[PDB]
Design a protein around this ligand. Structure first.
Ligand SMILES: Cn1c(=O)ccc2ccccc21
Length: 108
């Protein structure tokens, strides 16, 4: 029951990471790569951090997992212009993400 959710989330998270539009979100944004990012974005999130949280048994509900992944997308859309490559990847990956949640039948 805790293990089933874990399996499902791990599978979903791994598929998101393997996706060709995930590259911007793989790791914490680097300061050398992004002007005053950490002054603008107060709740940073990335897929590496999500993998640890998953490993650390943080994701006890669907809701917590969704909030973190959704935050990856909303941070990107707050920081970046709408026709930036980064914004485009976020929306592509978000579509993919929601497809995978629905395929898994995942609910709270
Ligand atoms: C996700 N993201 C941003 O949202 C903004 C800058 C940036 C730079 C390098 C890598 C990822 C980045």
């Amino acid at each position: 029951d805790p293990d089933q959710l874990y399996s499902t989330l791990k599978s979903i998270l791994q598929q998101v990471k393997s996706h060709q539009s995930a590259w911007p979100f793989m790791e914490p944004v680097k300061r050398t790569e992004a002007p005053g990012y950490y002054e603008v974005i107060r709740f940073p999130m990335d897929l590496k951090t999500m993998s640890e949280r998953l490993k650390n048994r943080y994701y006890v509900s669907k809701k917590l997992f969704m909030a973190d992944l959704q935050r990856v997308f909303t941070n990107c859309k707050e920081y970046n212009p709408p026709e930036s490559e980064y914004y485009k990847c976020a929306n592509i990956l978000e579509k993919f993400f929601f497809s995978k949640i629905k395929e898994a039948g995942l609910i709270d």
